[PDB]
Amino acid sequence: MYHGALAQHLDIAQLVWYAQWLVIWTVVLLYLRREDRREGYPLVEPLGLVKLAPEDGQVYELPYPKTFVLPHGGTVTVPRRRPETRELKLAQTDGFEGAPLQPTGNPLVDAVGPASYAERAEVVDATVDGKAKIVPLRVATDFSIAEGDVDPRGLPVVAADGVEAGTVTDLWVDRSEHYFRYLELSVAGSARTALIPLGFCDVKKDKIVVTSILSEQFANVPRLQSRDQITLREEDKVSAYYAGGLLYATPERAESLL
Amino acid sequence: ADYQTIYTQIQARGPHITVSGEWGDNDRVGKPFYSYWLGKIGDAQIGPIYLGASGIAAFAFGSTAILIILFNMAAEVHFDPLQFFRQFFWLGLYPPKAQYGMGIPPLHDGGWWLMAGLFMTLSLGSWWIRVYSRARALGLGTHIAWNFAAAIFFVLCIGCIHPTLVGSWSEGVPFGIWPHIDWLTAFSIRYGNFYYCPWHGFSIGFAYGCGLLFAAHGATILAVARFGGDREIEQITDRGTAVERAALFWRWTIGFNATIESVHRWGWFFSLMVMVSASVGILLTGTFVDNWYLWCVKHGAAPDYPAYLPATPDPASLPGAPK
Amino acid sequence: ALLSFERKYRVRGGTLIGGDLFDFWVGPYFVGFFGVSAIFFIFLGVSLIGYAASQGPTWDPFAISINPPDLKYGLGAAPLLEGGFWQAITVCALGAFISWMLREVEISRKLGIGWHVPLAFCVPIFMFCVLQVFRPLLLGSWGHAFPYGILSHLDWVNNFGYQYLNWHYNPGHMSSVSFLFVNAMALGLHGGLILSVANPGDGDKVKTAEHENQYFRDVVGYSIGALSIHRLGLFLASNIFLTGAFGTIASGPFWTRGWPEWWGWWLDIPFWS
Amino acid sequence: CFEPPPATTTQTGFRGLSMGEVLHPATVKAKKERDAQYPPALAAVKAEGPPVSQVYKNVKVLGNLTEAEFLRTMTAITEWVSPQEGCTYCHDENNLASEAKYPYVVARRMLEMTRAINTNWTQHVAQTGVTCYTCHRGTPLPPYVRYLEPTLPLNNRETPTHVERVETRSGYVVRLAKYTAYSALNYDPFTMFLANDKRQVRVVPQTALPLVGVSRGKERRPLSDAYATFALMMSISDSLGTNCTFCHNAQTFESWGKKSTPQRAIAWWGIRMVRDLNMNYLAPLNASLPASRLGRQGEAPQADCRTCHQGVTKPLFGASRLKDYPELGPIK
Ligand code: BCB
Ligand code: BCB
Ligand code: BCB
Ligand SMILES: C/C=C1/c2cc3[nH]c4c(c3C)C(=O)[C@H](C(=O)OC)c4c3nc(cc4[nH]c(cc(n2)[C@@H]1C)c(C(C)=O)c4C)[C@@H](C)[C@@H]3CCC(=O)OC/C=C(\C)CCC[C@H](C)CCC[C@H](C)CCCC(C)C
Ligand SMILES: C/C=C1/c2cc3[nH]c4c(c3C)C(=O)[C@H](C(=O)OC)c4c3nc(cc4[nH]c(cc(n2)[C@@H]1C)c(C(C)=O)c4C)[C@@H](C)[C@@H]3CCC(=O)OC/C=C(\C)CCC[C@H](C)CCC[C@H](C)CCCC(C)C
Ligand SMILES: CC(C)=CCC/C(C)=C/CC/C(C)=C/CC/C(C)=C/CC/C(C)=C/CC/C(C)=C/CC/C(C)=C/CC1=C(C)C(=O)c2ccccc2C1=O
Ligand code: HEC
Ligand code: HEC
Ligand code: HEC
Ligand code: HEC
Ligand SMILES: CC(C)=CCC/C(C)=C/C=C/C(C)=C/C=C/C(C)=C/C=C\C=C(C)\C=C\C=C(/C)CC/C=C(\C)CCCC(C)C
Ligand SMILES: CCCCCCCCCCCC[N+](C)(C)[O-]
Ligand SMILES: CCCCCCCCCCCC[N+](C)(C)[O-]
Ligand SMILES: CCCCCCCCCCCC[N+](C)(C)[O-]
Ligand SMILES: [Fe+3]
């Protein structure tokens, strides 16, 4: 007689094998794949004439809503309907639904394609104790640049066209993570300052090189409502602007690389 | 390129911050110091650290375990200091070589091994409590502790549950660098090649899966660091262009995508399954399966190949063959 | 057919080659030139696998095996059924992986994000080449590569290991295993951490970045940081293969003995022998 | 600590299973040269006259040989075993029938053992056979022998370090490791499997599920048995300068048929032959050898796979002298 035997050709291990696959597929399909749909669903499609009947499938693929209790008040529930009413300066290049869109104006200013920003809340991201998280050093008095690293203040900013476009006046630090996220510069020939994400800055000892956009384009960088604060949406607006340059700074950037 | 994703060009220094816990705030010890070079790729601050009862209990039990192991290893080289450092890797504390069934083995043949195992176990349980407690103290979910529990369970399976299930302490895992390694082959050989153990395969699938996932997730976040993708928490409570782009990169590539929060659920799951699958595999071994290869052959899953050199009959089964 | 926030990102541009010719989507899938070449190689590869398997002795998924040629064929072409198929399939595999990789680059450019993912994806492709191309070239025969079979490839791994008495003592392997293990652990920790902060339980408030720092400073005395752990994860996973490749390439071409004996350079130093 | 390419590789299994030898050319040639020192066969002599059983006085084994043949054999024996010492190593300069010197009686038993090997263990030595040289390699004391405890160096012609001395307890692990291809396996495969036929090498179950009656508690063989078998196999591999795939398809170590090579069955017979040599020829020699030859337990030096093979799949790369010295077997 054998341990694990249950019949002519049936044993314990064999049964557990089936159970294991069942557990895996159940967790993957019924749980994880639904959690994957707490953002962006239901999917969308250009309505034709008469079509407003919610398919059963749109209900089945979604999980029950969950609600996040925010640390500084309020709540967020997902999933939830979040259509984007904001007009988009884009036009269809061809007829089929899989065709790419093409900007109709200035993609950097119109904020489309890689220049697009999310509809984040117009609220200042906060620290655990309630203060503004991302602020310039002129404000974050107790914060400094570690000894050994370049102090960008006073240094010039050179754009992709090699032209100097401004002078760095300050650094914005993340008071929650002790980390610099933006540089503030005075824009040449303009009565405005602009922020630039550090990830778009090649920090040299004698200059700050920026290849994402041309000097002329620093003029249209999104502006902040305040001088010493920035909202989650502004952060997205500012970051998206430069990312947009990667593809739109010049006519050839969007065309085939090779 | 984004140099920030490689290292931190300009480091920042600021006041030491502390988040108060529901308790033990006065148990944090050490003065925080900063490392400039560390700050190039991580946070520059080192310490302070939290002590606590469970934490201290852990080091105490753990230290006892280690001493039992080191002393026995030292005995192996007749306490010669130079030979000890030389032969370290080859030294070990072994479980009973003789078959005593489930009987407590004599100190010289399994006794000390069992004792060390006991103290290691206590050390792990104590550390588990610390991992669990700190989360509670800080008002955090206990997801880490539950993942940690799966790993501890696996250790217990190869450590003493499987030995108990078959009734022999001899099956335990030795303490030592090469020795715990040698056990892997001894075990696989005894149980008919672990490659044919479905749960070994599942575990590997998930282990390899973790490599795939952290590589992809890690790369995904660096790719969107310019949009604050690293600030995952608020990207969860308030979707930013960072995760919209992350999701689309993946949807456009493989046809589907996760959310910034769910991708962590997938990661957590894959990680947990490496240990859960491994445990199930061990629990079934010896208990209900003696030879995994034959088990696969029995269910017609094993591949077969033509002979290259002539097929060789077992000489032992030939007529007149010696014993 | 579109995520609620997707349309604004679906613009033209970002390709490496092809331009507007293949710059479009089919369902949620971006195509591009490399999507076309990818499908081409996949279709081709799968066709070869099906045809080769049909010539085989079984249709059972676990037993099907398409093997490389005998060592005697060296680096030359082998007859279809005797390794030729394996050779053709290997080429299609390579074509499909590299296309897939290059396709991710086009997707990255279009979205204005870093190219880190395709870069990361090069690591597993590299390892495939070490096993199937480089090592076989150094040993002089395609016959040293692994077979395409769900279980048969495990048999190859198995014998390969044992050809060096005990593969566990291979130092490149020791490093590889360590990274595999650390990475799995770190992913669980990172996954768990993020979930524990956004899902505290009951009706408590979502926590913060400061809480993440506090948790690990308390538990292990150090907090590496949010962006850093992602950089570390990519590093730990990539090194599973980057370091492992050394242990693989070394076996045969640079070491023909058992791996344990390799440790003699240490054990046999005259000073303590 | 690496070996420069190219590497010589053979195939011993179906394409794609990665089964085969992996050799470093320099090493193979160095062994070929060492083994090439095998003295050539002495010129054949015409059998003329009466059998030495009549001619000489104390010939118990080679008595059927004529005087010329017999002396030819003594010359070969001297060249294989004691070339440096000469005939007087086993003989009294003034009486060739005297058994006064121990090498004499030992050599007599050895003549029997050798003839036994070439006659009764044909399943292993085939038509290649062995001669005194196979093991002795020109010295009374064979370079590769084993005592009841691991000794270092493996080649006794080498001078031991203090630590390698069997008396030095702190060197035990290394002595064991060097005998098991450097592994850390805490078992000595010689005393366990080759000195006698007490233990069973196989440890792998022959059924998919655990048979009730032998799978629980004290009914089970301890896992230590598996480590031991592995150690034996490491030892065997290093002794022939080969790897596991030379005999097994690792897919299933316990299977024969297509899962094993002819070489595995030959090795199987080698194990039986080695046990026979140790139990019935070498071990007993402790009663006829000086204490200086015995081990710490009064055991006579014994043989293992290396004793003959010395790191080559075939001793002396297959060289044979069987037809040149039929007196050594096979005996009809
Ligand atoms: C020749 C022998 C073989 C073998 C034998 C083997 C065995 C015997 C076992 C595995 C198992 C496993 N194997 Mg296999 N294996 C694996 C991969 C794997 C893993 C996925 C899995 C173990 C999971 C793990 O993370 O352990 C690493 C993680 C561990 C040990 C948990 C750590 C927990 C943590 C609490 C520890 C904390 C430590 C404290 C600091 C310690 C302090 C101590 C002090 C106090 C003394 C691969 C990828 C391959 C390949 C490519 O060939 C392979 C081949 C083989 N394995 C061979 C066929 N393997 C296991 C399995 O899945 O069985 C089904 C198993 O038991
Ligand atoms: C040097 C060591 C090697 C190794 C060692 C290894 C071990 C020891 C084990 C596996 C296992 C597995 N391996 Mg192998 N392997 C496989 C694929 C596979 C899967 C059948 C399975 C689980 C994969 C997984 O979850 O990973 C992580 C990836 C995930 C989670 C994403 C999903 C991947 C998907 C499952 C892949 C499915 C592949 C298909 C079966 C066939 C693909 C071709 C088709 C489309 C024509 C591929 C595709 C390749 C290639 C192309 O290089 C490869 C190379 C190698 N494996 C190396 C030769 N592999 C395990 C197994 O169960 O074997 C049966 C196992 O035990
Ligand atoms: C007896 C033999 C053994 C052995 C033999 C062995 C060998 C011979 C090798 C390893 C290697 C490795 N082993 Mg070891 N091993 C490992 C772990 C590991 C890995 C870390 C490492 C790399 C695996 C690899 O190359 O994947 C390869 C995976 C690839 C190439 C994936 C390619 C994916 C591809 C790019 C895309 C595929 C796409 C699909 C086809 C798409 C399908 C689409 C569908 C899903 C829609 C562990 C944890 C253990 C344990 C616990 O014992 C172990 C034991 C052993 N190994 C045994 C002792 N091991 C390798 C190494 O690095 O050694 C240093 C190696 O060469
Ligand atoms: C799939 C998921 C997996 C997974 C998961 C997870 N893994 C976790 C967690 C999760 C989720 C945790 O939450 C927990 C943790 O906390 O993370 C920060 C943890 C951990 N995983 C560790 C090791 C690890 N994980 C491995 C594997 C996997 N993990 C798998 C892959 C492996 C492998 C690969 O072998 C290893 C080696 C430890 C670092 C840690 C436990 C600490 C402990 O339990 O120690 C207990 C305490 C001691 C040993 C104390 C004694 C120590 C000292 C130095 C002795 C001093 C002696 C001296 C004489 C004293 C006097 C000195 C004198 C000067 C005065
Ligand atoms: C160190 C870092 C690691 C790492 C990293 C990353 N991994 C990535 C990415 C990153 C970063 C991606 O961006 C890319 C992706 O998109 O993610 C979803 C990807 C992917 N990782 C896959 C499989 C995977 N990753 C493995 C390992 C690691 N990944 C390691 C751990 C393993 C192991 C361990 O076995 C597997 C099996 C695919 C799912 C996917 C590519 C599919 C493809 O290429 O599409 C194009 C190709 C096809 C759809 C099929 C082509 C079939 C050919 C023509 C015919 C068959 C040939 C074949 C050789 C037969 C084999 C048979 C088999 C039984 C022997
Ligand atoms: C019909 C046709 C042939 C058309 C032509 C066009 C064309 C080129 C089509 C391609 C068709 C093909 C070949 C499809 C197969 C695609 C493949 C390879 C699918 C494999 C999917 C697998 C098995 C992935 C393995 C990893 C895994 C288990 C992932 C699940 C979780 C996900 C979705 C992770 C990805 C993911 C990660 C890693 C993040 O970090 C992240 C961060 C923030 C938001 C989202 C994400 C996110 O989605
Ligand atoms: C030990 C290894 C020996 C060496 C070296 C030589 N001889 Fe020997 N010899 C040996 C034995 C055990 C025997 C007995 C053979 C038997 O079948 O029983 C002998 C015998 C002889 C004899 C016969 C003497 C007699 O019985 O009258 C002769 C003549 C003889 N040996 C000669 C001889 C010479 C000249 C040698 C060197 C060339 C020589 N022997 C070496 C063992 C050994
Ligand atoms: C390996 C299988 C052997 C073959 C074949 C022959 N000999 Fe041997 N011999 C062998 C061993 C392991 C030993 C024991 C250790 C020892 O050196 O005593 C010996 C010993 C002898 C001796 C005595 C050596 C001494 O101590 O001075 C002699 C003289 C001897 N062997 C002779 C001899 C002859 C003539 C052989 C062929 C007929 C022969 N040996 C074969 C192992 C092996
Ligand atoms: C031929 C020269 C061999 C080499 C090289 C290796 N093995 Fe072997 N092995 C061989 C034989 C003749 C036997 C049977 C012994 C007997 O007395 O019947 C074995 C057996 C094993 C086993 C046990 C199989 C069983 O039925 O339980 C194992 C697990 C094994 N061998 C493993 C193994 C490994 C890992 C090797 C390289 C280190 C190896 N073998 C080499 C002959 C030969
Ligand atoms: C001398 C008395 C031997 C001892 C002790 C062992 N072997 Fe041997 N082996 C010996 C000879 C003369 C031969 C014949 C060679 C020939 O040409 O046929 C062999 C051969 C083998 C083989 C065959 C290898 C091949 O290429 O075919 C193997 C695999 C082998 N021997 C294994 C082996 C093992 C494992 C031993 C210890 C248990 C062993 N041999 C001892 C002589 C002697
Ligand atoms: C009491 C009763 C009735 C039953 C108890 C049953 C019980 C719960 C038993 C449990 C047994 C268990 C869990 C055993 C498991 C053992 C396992 C899995 C061990 C595995 C591997 C061990 C290894 C690798 C460790 C070896 C040891 C070391 C390297 C020594 C320690 C070294 C250091 C601390 C570093 C020192 C550095 C310094 C010299 C500079
Ligand atoms: C690592 C994978 C090992 C082989 C696993 C093979 C599948 C399990 C065995 C077959 C189970 C199903 N069956 C044949 C009963 O239908
Ligand atoms: C060890 C094997 C683990 C297999 C895990 C498979 C995970 C990927 C499943 C993707 C399913 C996708 N989809 C869109 C069909 O739901
Ligand atoms: C063994 C696990 C295999 C998982 C294979 C998953 C294939 C998924 C193919 C893309 C699915 C696309 N989608 C979601 C749009 O339908
Ligand atoms: Fe993350």
Are D90 and D225 members of one domain?
Answer: no
| Burial environment of residue C268 by CB neighbours within 10 A (0 to 12, 13 to 18, 19 or more) | middle
Partners of D217 on chain B (C-beta within 8 Å) are 101-102, 166-168
Is residue B314 in a domain?
Answer: no
For residue A197, list its beta bridge partners: A182
Domain boundaries, chain A: 2-119, 120-258
Name the DSSP class of B70. H
Alpha-helical runs (H) found in A70-192: 107-110
Asked if residues D245 and B126 have their Cβ atoms less than 8 Å apart, the reply is no
Local structure of A44: helix, strand or coil: strand
Tell me the C-alpha distance between A202 and A157, whole Å.
Answer: 10
Partners of D223 on chain B (C-beta within 8 Å) are 168, 170-171, 186-187, 190
Question: In CATH terms, is domain C1-165 a member of 1.20.85.10?
Answer: yes
Are B149 and B139 members of one domain?
Answer: no
| Residue A42 preceded by cis peptide, ω within 30 | yes
The type of residue at A247 is L
Per-residue b or e along B52-66, where b marks 16 or more CB atoms closer than 10 Å to that residue's CB = bebbebbeebbebbe
Are B278 and B265 members of one domain?
Answer: yes
Q: Does B280 touch chain A (CB under 8 A)?
A: yes
B50 token code pair: 């939290």
Is residue D296 in a domain?
Answer: yes
Asked if residues B281 and B200 have their Cβ atoms less than 8 Å apart, the reply is yes
Tell me the C-alpha distance between C46 and D54, whole Å.
Answer: 83
Q: Which of C162, C96, C133 is nearest to C249 (CA)?
A: C133
Asked if residues B30 and B48 have their Cβ atoms less than 8 Å apart, the reply is yes
Tell me the C-alpha distance between C200 and A63, whole Å.
Answer: 19
| Burial environment of residue D164 by CB neighbours within 10 A (0 to 12, 13 to 18, 19 or more) | middle
Are D231 and D117 members of one domain?
Answer: no
Is residue B114 in a domain?
Answer: yes
Asked if residues D128 and D322 have their Cβ atoms less than 8 Å apart, the reply is yes
Taking one residue from A and the other from B, the number of pairs with CB-CB distance under 8 angstroms is 162
Are B75 and B151 members of one domain?
Answer: no
Q: Which of C119, C104, C114 is nearest to C29 (CA)?
A: C104
Output phi, psi for A196, to 5 deg: -140, 130
Q: Answer with the one of B125, B143, B161 that is the final residue of a domain.
A: B143
C248 min Cα distance to partner chain B (Å) = 17
Tell me the C-alpha distance between D212 and C147, whole Å.
Answer: 38
The type of residue at C181 is F
Q: Which of A189, A246, A184 is nearest to A213 (CA)?
A: A246
Local structure of A172: helix, strand or coil: strand
Asked if residues B178 and C169 have their Cβ atoms less than 8 Å apart, the reply is yes
Partners of D214 on chain A (C-beta within 8 Å) are none
Q: Which of C127, B299, C29 is nearest to A98 (CA)?
A: C29
Q: Does C1 touch chain A (CB under 8 A)?
A: yes
Superfamily of domain A120-258 in CATH is: Photosynthetic Reaction Center, subunit H, domain 2 (3.90.50.10)
Q: Between helices B198-223 and A12-25, what is the axis angle to 10°?
A: 20
Name the DSSP class of A217. G
Tell me the C-alpha distance between B217 and C254, whole Å.
Answer: 36
Are D152 and D296 members of one domain?
Answer: yes
CB contact under 8 A, A84 and C5: yes
| Burial environment of residue C226 by CB neighbours within 10 A (0 to 12, 13 to 18, 19 or more) | buried
Is residue B187 in a domain?
Answer: yes
C101 token code pair: 């990789």
Name the DSSP class of C158. H
Are B24 and B60 members of one domain?
Answer: yes
Q: Which CATH number fits domain A2-119: 1.10.10.10, 3.40.710.10, 4.10.540.10, 2.40.40.20?
A: 4.10.540.10
Name the DSSP class of C148. B
Is residue D210 in a domain?
Answer: no
Residues with CB under 6 A from ligand 12: A 14, 17; B 196, 198, 201, 296, 299-301; C 62
Asked if residues B220 and C229 have their Cβ atoms less than 8 Å apart, the reply is no
CB contact under 8 A, B293 and D174: no
Are D174 and D35 members of one domain?
Answer: no
Q: Quick one: CA torsion of B215, B220, B226, B232, rounded to 10 degrees?
A: -100
Q: Which helix (H) or strand (E) holds A156?
A: strand A156-158
Which residue lies with its CA nearest to atom 6 of ligand 12?
B301
CB atoms within 10 A of CB C167: 19
Is residue B256 in a domain?
Answer: yes
Query: What pairing do the DSSP bridges indicate for beta strands C29-30 and D8-9?
Result: unpaired
CB contact under 8 A, A4 and D212: no
Are D160 and D113 members of one domain?
Answer: no
DSSP one-letter string for D157-168: TSPP-TTTSTT-
Asked if residues B98 and B121 have their Cβ atoms less than 8 Å apart, the reply is no
Asked if residues B18 and C217 have their Cβ atoms less than 8 Å apart, the reply is no
Query: What pairing do the DSSP bridges indicate for beta strands A156-158 and A208-209?
Result: parallel
Are B152 and B195 members of one domain?
Answer: yes
Tell me the C-alpha distance between B293 and B197, whole Å.
Answer: 8
Q: Which helix (H) or strand (E) holds C197?
A: helix C171-198
Output phi, psi for B120, to 5 deg: -65, -45
Asked if residues B303 and C151 have their Cβ atoms less than 8 Å apart, the reply is yes
Unique residue bearing structure tokens 């390899």: B208
Count Cα neighbours of A145 within 13 Å in the Cβ-side half-sphere: 17
Asked if residues D11 and C71 have their Cβ atoms less than 8 Å apart, the reply is yes
| Residue D6 preceded by cis peptide, ω within 30 | yes
Are B189 and B237 members of one domain?
Answer: yes
Are D262 and D119 members of one domain?
Answer: no
Alpha-helical runs (H) found in chain B: 53-76, 81-87, 111-137, 143-156, 162-166, 177-190, 198-223, 232-237, 241-254, 262-284, 292-298
Residues 6+ apart with CB under 8 A from A73: none
Unique residue bearing structure tokens 């070996």: D3
Is residue D301 in a domain?
Answer: yes
Residues 6+ apart with CB under 8 A from D279: D195, D196, D197
Are B227 and B251 members of one domain?
Answer: yes
Asked if residues A157 and A185 have their Cβ atoms less than 8 Å apart, the reply is yes
Asked if residues A104 and C28 have their Cβ atoms less than 8 Å apart, the reply is no
Is residue D11 in a domain?
Answer: no
Ligand 9 center–CA D286 separation, angstroms? 31
Are B129 and B261 members of one domain?
Answer: no
Residues 6+ apart with CB under 8 A from B204: none
Tell me the C-alpha distance between B92 and D231, whole Å.
Answer: 16
Asked if residues A152 and B10 have their Cβ atoms less than 8 Å apart, the reply is yes
Tell me the C-alpha distance between D79 and D136, whole Å.
Answer: 10
Q: Which helix (H) or strand (E) holds A173?
A: strand A164-174
Ligand 12 center–CA B302 separation, angstroms? 8
If one counts the domains in chain B, the total is: 2
Tell me the C-alpha distance between A104 and A118, whole Å.
Answer: 20
Are D103 and D186 members of one domain?
Answer: no
C203 token code pair: 């009706």
Angstrom CA distances, B36 to A146, B9, B155, D109, D273, stand at 8, 12, 38, 78, 69
Count Cα neighbours of B211 within 13 Å in the Cβ-side half-sphere: 21
**R_g (Cα) of chain D, nearest Å:** 22
- φ/ψ region of B85 (left if φ > 0, alpha if ψ in -120 to 50, else beta) reads alpha
Ligand 9 nearest-atom number relative to CA D242: 5
Q: Which of B170, B149, B150, B30 is nearest to B102 (CA)?
A: B170
Local structure of A244: helix, strand or coil: helix
DSSP one-letter string for A183-214: EEEEETTSS-EEEEEGGG-EE-SS-EE--SS-
Q: Answer with the one of B143, B174, B192 that is the final residue of a domain.
A: B143
Contact partners of C by the rule of 3+ C-beta pairs under 8 A? A, B, D
Alpha-helical runs (H) found in D57-196: 67-81, 102-120, 122-125, 132-136, 172-179, 189
**Domain that includes residue B26, residue range:** 1-143
Handedness of CA B240, B245, B248, B253 (dihedral sign): negative
CATH code at position B251: 1.20.85.10
Asked if residues B83 and B61 have their Cβ atoms less than 8 Å apart, the reply is no
Residues 6+ apart with CB under 8 A from A145: A151, A171, B10, B11, B12, B13
Cβ within 8 Å of A, B 20-39? 34, 36, 39
CATH code at position D284: 1.10.468.10
**Domain that includes residue D47, residue range:** 24-142+314-332
**Helices and strands, counts by H and E, chain D:** 11, 2
Name the DSSP class of B78. T
For residue B50, list its beta bridge partners: B28
- Residue in chain B nearest A140 by alpha carbon: B14
Angstrom CA distances, C70 to B72, B151, D19, D247, stand at 50, 43, 11, 18
Tell me the C-alpha distance between B108 and B90, whole Å.
Answer: 18
Q: Which of B194, B171, B260, A4 is nearest to D250 (CA)?
A: B194
D154 token code pair: 């493996």
Local structure of A169: helix, strand or coil: strand
Tell me the C-alpha distance between C28 and C39, whole Å.
Answer: 15
Q: Which of A250, A204, A163, A159 is nearest to B3 (CA)?
A: A204
Q: Strand ranges (DSSP E) for chain D?
A: 8-9, 22-23
Name the DSSP class of D289. S
Question: In CATH terms, is domain C166-273 a member of 1.20.85.10?
Answer: yes
Ligand 15 center–CA A221 separation, angstroms? 29
The type of residue at B174 is P
Handedness of CA C204, C206, C212, C214 (dihedral sign): negative
Query: What's the angle, vertex CA B256, arms to CA B250 and CA B260, rounded to 5?
Result: 60
Q: Does C227 touch chain A (CB under 8 A)?
A: yes
Ligand 7 probe mutation, D75, D89, D90, most atoms within 8 A of CB: D90
Tell me the C-alpha distance between D164 and D301, whole Å.
Answer: 17
Q: Which of B114, B123, B125 is nearest to B174 (CA)?
A: B114
